[PDB]
C-alpha cells in the first residue's frame, strides 16, 4: 500500500493500556498465583503469552473471570512478566532470573526465555 | 530502574491485537457509523482516541455493547482510522483526506489531525 506510519503509535497504545490496568479500567480477569491475585485484560495477556492465547481461545475458558496458575509458579516472577507485557521493560536480576525464566517458559513467552538463557550462560 | 527493554514488544502486541480483531476474538463493542458496523476492543479504542476514552470511562456507557457515532461521520474515514489504531499505518489519500481529518477531529486523535493538516497545507 501507500500508507504512512506513526513510529510511536504502538508504544503509546501500550502505555495507555498500562494506565487502564493501573486504574483497574475494563480489566476482565484475575490471575491467581498461589496467595496472590493480579487483575489484567485478557486481550493483552493473549497478545503476550502462548499459554494465555491458548486459554482464552478455548470456548469454555474464554468466559472465566478467574484463572488459577500451576502452584509451582512464583508470584514475583509472574508480577515481573505481567509488568513486561504492559511496558516492554523486564526487571531481570540475579535474585529473580531463575523464577522469571521458569514463569516465562510456563507462559510461553519465547523472547523472555531467550534473554534469560543468555544472561544465565554469561554467568557460567 | 535497571530493566532491559525488548524493542519490538509494543509492535508485536499491536500486531496480535489486530489478529484478534480480524478473527473477531474477545471484541466487546460494535461501532455503528450510519449503515456500517465495526467490531472492536473497547480498550484499544480508548488507548487510541480521546472520544472513546471519555465514552468508556463513563459509568453507564462503559457497559454498552453498541455505540452510535454522529450521522455526519463518514464510514470509510472511520474504517481508515480503526485500521490505523490497530496497525500504526494510515491510508491517507487525496480522495479521503478531508473525511479522515474530520473523523480524527471527532475521535480526538491529535497526531492524525496534525499529519492531515500538514498534508493539506502542502497542497495549497
Amino acid at each position: 500500500d501507500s500508507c504512512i506510519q506513526f513510529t510511536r503509535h504502538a508504544s503509546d497504545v501500550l502505555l495507555n493500556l498500562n494506565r487502564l490496568r493501573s486504574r483497574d479500567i475494563l480489566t476482565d480477569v484475575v490471575i491467581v498465583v498461589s496467595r496472590e491475585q493480579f487483575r489484567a485484560h485478557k486481550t493483552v495477556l493473549m497478545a503476550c503469552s502462548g499459554l494465555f492465547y491458548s486459554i482464552f481461545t478455548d470456548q469454555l475458558k474464554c468466559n472465566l473471570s478467574v484463572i488459577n496458575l500451576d502452584p509451582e509458579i512464583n508470584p514475583e516472577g509472574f508480577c515481573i512478566l505481567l509488568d513486561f507485557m504492559y511496558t516492554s521493560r523486564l526487571n531481570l536480576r540475579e535474585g529473580n532470573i531463575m523464577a522469571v525464566m521458569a514463569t516465562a517458559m510456563y507462559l510461553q513467552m519465547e523472547h523472555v526465555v531467550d534473554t534469560c538463557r543468555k544472561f544465565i550462560k554469561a554467568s557460567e | 530502574d535497571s530493566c532491559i527493554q525488548f524493542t519490538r514488544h509494543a509492535s508485536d502486541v499491536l500486531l496480535n491485537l489486530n489478529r484478534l480483531r480480524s478473527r473477531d476474538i474477545l471484541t466487546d463493542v460494535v461501532i455503528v457509523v450510519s449503515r456500517e458496523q465495526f467490531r472492536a476492543h473497547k480498550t484499544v479504542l480508548m488507548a487510541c482516541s480521546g472520544l472513546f476514552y471519555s465514552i468508556f470511562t463513563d459509568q453507564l456507557k462503559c457497559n454498552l455493547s453498541v455505540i452510535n457515532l454522529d450521522p455526519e461521520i463518514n464510514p470509510e474515514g472511520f474504517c481508515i482510522l480503526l485500521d490505523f489504531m490497530y496497525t500504526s499505518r494510515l491510508n491517507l489519500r487525496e480522495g479521503n483526506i478531508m473525511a479522515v481529518m474530520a473523523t480524527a477531529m471527532y475521535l480526538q486523535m491529535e497526531h492524525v489531525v496534525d499529519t492531515c493538516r500538514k498534508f493539506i497545507k502542502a497542497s495549497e
Binding site: 500508507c3 504512512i4 506510519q5 506513526f6 513510529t7 | 499505518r89 494510515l90 497526531h111 499529519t115
Partner: peptide, 4 residues
C-alpha cells in the same frame, strides 16, 4: 510520521 514515516514511509514504512
Amino acid at each position: 510520521w514515516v514511509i514504512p
